[PDB]
Design a binder for this molecule. Structure first.
Ligand SMILES: Cc1cc(/C=C/C#N)cc(C)c1Nc1ccnc(Nc2ccc(C#N)cc2)n1
Ligand SMILES: O=C(O)c1cc2cc(F)ccc2[nH]1
Ligand SMILES: O=C(O)c1cc2cc(F)ccc2[nH]1
Ligand SMILES: [Mg+2]
Lengths: 556, 415
């Protein structure tokens, strides 16, 4: 024989303070017991398991499942209890490769490594914890006791240890053949290259040889699976990729379940199908989670669904990454806090698409949302391609400079250029930095009774203009906002406004253009119509004239 | 040469932190560095039975073109034991902040000469990721004292003092303080003299060493010139209504910090409902009240003390035009130090690079005065900061930070 290199075992431990499993073996029919005996005898012939003496105190239940539409049974060792007691492992399958980051390949061959899996031995000191028992016929003899010598199917550490064992085997072959790509998924190895099919098939045979150094055989009758590959919900072709078919169902009535799976399909399709929107459909699941209840779909939801059906009429494909060309990312505003983007290298051939939704919060504006969408695309691009794309944004360079220089927070967008495709992101108002000469000065204030919810809001001005409005079902914070709204309502196009509300300033200094409070939205609408607005703050209850006068009027 | 026994804290598992995304240039740099470190035995490949992980990335130290590997041991450092076996601690030298030239030296590569306890090495696990996760991440662990781990200076301290024994008693005047991978040396000498005793210092570490890649560097500070911020009120000949409102607002704020601040006569000047731009003459009662407040603001704050058992907190405000203000405190309104920056380096168009450099300079100041880093309250969205701060980081340590989402009105009073 030819000597083969052994696969070094991974030392496995149980979690600290825990012991192995000691679970009862279920009673089995006489027909199931025979089937397990013949199955386990074959596994023992192949070296997968070994019979053990009675001193081993551990046990894991075994079952026999009828392979549907066949007279052949199949074994199942229920390692659920041992998995609870097995240590945590490093899981490399943490992050899938995104197809948009892959490179085009002329040839991609598949090799089966199913036999190589049980050539990976289990740590000798851990094998005792995998003990199981086949019940004897009529319970008149001791049951047959086995333990595993290889990675058992269903055990917690089997995927991680197999992947790491094969990784260590493939490392020298990949390093010394940099003109090929190798990827492992389940019991298969995928080898791609740009080599001519003669040189490519030579590399495949060289890989088969290299695998025999460890005694791992691969089937000679080459794999039936061939491009395209159905993999992780994608369709992989040699020079293109897409998602597996997205079919939106026809339904006269929709359930919470139907909408949950509908948004999931739309989210999955949004990575290559441009312009997918899910806000109005996702609004219908707000707060409630009774799986079977029916929800009437709003007219806003039927339009969004009809728009999505029109986007999904015909297939759309993405191209693969060319490292020799720049990445370009373009963003568009869709409305209602929805943003869509495309990432490409050559015009009209996207690598991938995507979308971004506004975070739920009290107040926000378009510039903040565009900034957040840029940071999400940036991070996603570092993951997939290892570099930041050049951005094409629907915001003028002058608008951005005005925003970030005056915004109270530090903010930054990477290298970008303006693209003139409406709707453009703009600033709807900008407060003055100094008081306005000639503009009327409005001293506003509001107050409310915490028990009766009754309050007043109003203002007094330097020209003698006054107003106090009685209010019901309001709070101290609402009256302070209402008072500012009244000053904006009753003033000319330039106005100075003096308030003592730290609450109202914390809102307005955040510069929102849309809010969850309609009262703030009315103030924003008033601010947009003005020419000049100066907002000044003073502390309350300090004898500040103007503020002191209106406070007595509104707190009465 | 013999490992010191090291344990975590009771009822505490190792770190399991996710490796954040890295650019192509940083991955290739880390692969080249770790390949060399593996050849020199500093690190070793690990298997899947090690579930722990600590993030890693690469930087460029100030004034150099070579990549430096930096491990973010923040989570591990929280979880390792506190070492008071030989010394309860290093009583922080209060004289370092009073020398007029302090140079920072990167001596972290000297840690690699001491092996790490075999049972603790698994907790230093880190991963070199691959682009698009196309190839399995490269998994390493440390065989020697790692840079950035709080146990490295504690374990190596026994060796460091003996290396510096010939230099320190030759130059008794000179203050030497170690924080993590950094060595701060303060002197009262002239700078031309200063840099050559800096390299005189470098003599000892390469002499024993037999090469450290970043030992030839020097970060020159001047803690004697470090400027304070006292509260100052405007001096005007004509005061508008808006001017007096802003003044009363600032004085009301200072009254939380200083007891005897009064605003009653100044507020009376606002009696009526006047235009914001109208000039108001100061009454006498108001001028005296203003002068009395000026006198109060020239004294220090009462009951201000540093407590080494409490965390230092650093707040930062963006003032515009590349200027930033900051305050270090442990209790509200009890500022231990305040300052202001404007000379922010090569980022007149990048807010985040300015803030990242402000954080590093404030942390450097905090290390010199108190010997520990503060927890920052950053005026930036979390997603914006975490995307970009690693691109402008040049220090070997990393402080803690939280994010401010509400605009502080105290910014009006620190400009
Ligand atoms: C991640 C991955 C999944 C499969 C697929 C697993 C399955 N099922 C096959 C391979 C070879 C890879 N690895 C890599 C690495 C770099 N570029 C590429 N490009 C690439 C991959 C497939 C096709 C095709 N057809 C074309 C180009 N693949
Ligand atoms: O470059 C590759 O395709 C590659 C590198 C590599 C290293 C391993 F350890 C296993 C598979 C691999 N594939
Ligand atoms: O760039 C803009 O959109 C913008 C700038 C600006 C300045 C103002 F004074 C008022 C509104 C604005 N909008
Ligand atoms: Mg009031």
């Amino acid at each position: 024989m030819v000597p083969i290199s052994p696969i070094e075992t991974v030392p496995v431990k149980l979690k600290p303070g825990m012991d192995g499993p000691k679970v009862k073996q279920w009673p089995l029919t006489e027909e199931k017991i025979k089937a397990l005996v013949e199955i386990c005898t074959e596994m023992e012939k192949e070296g997968k398991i070994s019979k053990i003496g009675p001193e081993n105190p551990y046990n894991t239940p075994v079952f026999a499942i009828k392979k549907k539409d066949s007279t052949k049974w199949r074994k199942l060792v229920d390692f659920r209890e041992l998995n609870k007691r097995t240590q945590d492992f490093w899981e490399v399958q943490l992050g899938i490769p995104h197809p948009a980051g892959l490179k085009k390949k002329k040839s991609v061959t598949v090799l089966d490594v199913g036999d190589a899996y049980f050539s990976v031995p289990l740590d000798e000191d851990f094998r005792k914890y995998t003990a199981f028992t086949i019940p004897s016929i009529n319970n008149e003899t001791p049951g047959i006791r086995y333990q595993y010598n290889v990675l058992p199917q269903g055990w917690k550490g089997s995927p991680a240890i197999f992947q790491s064992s094969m990784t260590k085997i493939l490392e020298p072959f990949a390093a010394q053949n940099p003109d090929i790509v190798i990827y492992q998924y389940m019991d298969d190895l995928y080898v791609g290259s740009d080599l001519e099919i003669g040189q490519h098939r030579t590399k495949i045979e060289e890989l088969r040889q290299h695998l025999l150094r460890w005694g791992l055989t691969t089937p000679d009758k080459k794999h039936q699976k061939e491009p395209p590959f159905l993999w992780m919900g994608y369709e992989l072709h040699p020079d293109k990729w897409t998602v597996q078919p997205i079919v939106l169902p026809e339904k006269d009535s929709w359930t919470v379940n139907d909408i949950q799976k509908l948004v999931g399909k739309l989210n999955w399709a949004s990575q290559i199908y441009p312009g997918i929107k899910v806000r109005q459909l996702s609004k219908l699941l707000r707060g409630t989670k009774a799986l079977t209840e029916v929800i009437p779909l709003t007219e806003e939801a039927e339009l969004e669904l009809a728009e999505n059906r029109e986007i999904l009429k015909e297939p759309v494909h993405g191209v693969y990454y060319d490292p020799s060309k720049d990445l370009i990312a373009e963003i568009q505003k869709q409305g209602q806090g929805q943003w869509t983007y495309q990432i490409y290298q050559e015009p009209f051939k996207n690598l991938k698409t995507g979308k971004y939704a506004r975070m739920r919060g009290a107040h926000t504006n378009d510039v903040k949302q565009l900034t957040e969408a840029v940071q999400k695309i940036t991070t996603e691009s570092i993951v997939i391609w290892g570099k930041t794309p050049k951005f094409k944004l629907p915001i003028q360079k002058e608008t951005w400079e005005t925003w970030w220089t005056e915004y109270w927070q530090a903010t930054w967008i990477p290298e970008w250029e303006f693209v003139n495709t409406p709707p453009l992101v703009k600033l709807w108002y900008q407060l003055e930095k100094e008081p306005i000469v000639g503009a009327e000065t409005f001293y506003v204030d509001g107050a409310a009774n915490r028990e009766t919810k009754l309050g007043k809001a109003g203002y007094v001005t330097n020209k003698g203009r006054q107003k106090v409005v009685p209010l019901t079902n309001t709070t101290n914070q609402k009256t302070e906002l209402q008072a500012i709204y009244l000053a904006l309502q009753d003033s000319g196009l330039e106005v100075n406004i003096v308030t003592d509300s730290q609450y109202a300033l914390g809102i307005i200094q955040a510069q929102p253009d849309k809010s969850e409070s309609e009262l703030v939205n009315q103030i924003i609408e008033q601010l947009i119509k003005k020419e000049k607005v100066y907002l000044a703050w003073v502390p309350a209850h300090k004898g500040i004239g103007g503020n002191e006068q209106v406070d007595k009027l509104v707190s009465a | 040469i013999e490992t010191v026994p090291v344990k975590l804290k009771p009822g505490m598992d190792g770190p399991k932190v996710k490796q954040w995304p890295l650019t192509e240039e940083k991955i290739k740099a880390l692969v080249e560095i770790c390949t060399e470190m593996e050849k020199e035995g500093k690190i070793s490949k690990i298997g899947p039975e090690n579930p722990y992980n600590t993030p890693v990335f690469a930087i460029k130290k100030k004034d150099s073109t070579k990549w430096r590997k930096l491990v973010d041991f923040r989570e591990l450092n929280k979880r390792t034991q506190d070492f008071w076996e030989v010394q309860l601690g290093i009583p922080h030298p209060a004289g370092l902040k009073k020398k007029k030239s302090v140079t920072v030296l990167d001596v972290g590569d000297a840690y690699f000469s001491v092996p790490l306890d075999e049972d603790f090495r698994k907790y230093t696990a880190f991963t070199i990721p691959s682009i698009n996760n196309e190839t399995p991440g490269i998994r390493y662990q440390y065989n020697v004292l790692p840079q950035g781990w709080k146990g490295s200076p504690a374990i190596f301290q026994s060796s460091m003092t003996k290396i510096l024994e010939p230099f320190k008693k030759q130059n008794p005047d000179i203050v030497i303080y170690q924080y993590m991978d950094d060595l701060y040396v303060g002197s009262d000498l002239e700078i031309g003299q200063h840099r050559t005793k800096i390299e005189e210092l470098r003599q000892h570490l390469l002499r024993w060493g037999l090469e450290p890649p970043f030992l030839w560097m020097g970060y020159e500070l001047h803690p004697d010139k470090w400027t304070v911020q006292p509260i100052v009120l405007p001096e005007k000949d004509s005061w508008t209504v808006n001017d007096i409102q802003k003044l009363v607002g600032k004085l009301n704020w200072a009254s939380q910090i200083y007891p005897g601040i009064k605003v009653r006569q100044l507020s009376k000047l606002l009696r009526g409902t006047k235009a914001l731009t109208e000039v108001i003459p100061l009454t006498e009662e108001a001028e005296l009240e203003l002068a009395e407040n000026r006198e109060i603001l020239k004294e220090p704050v009462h009951g201000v003390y540093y407590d080494p058992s409490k965390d230092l907190i650093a707040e930062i405000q963006k003032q515009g035009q590349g200027q930033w203000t900051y305050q270090i405190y442990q209790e509200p309104f009890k500022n231990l130090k305040t300052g202001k920056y404007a000379r922010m380096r090569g980022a007149h168009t990048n807010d985040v690079k300015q803030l990242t450099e402000a954080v590093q300079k404030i942390t450097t100041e905090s290390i010199v005065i108190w010997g520990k880093t503060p927890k920052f309250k950053l005026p930036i969205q979390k997603e914006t900061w975490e995307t970009w701060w690693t691109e402008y980081w040049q220090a070997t340590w990393i402080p803690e930070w939280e994010f401010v989402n509400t605009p502080p009105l105290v910014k009006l009073w620190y400009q």
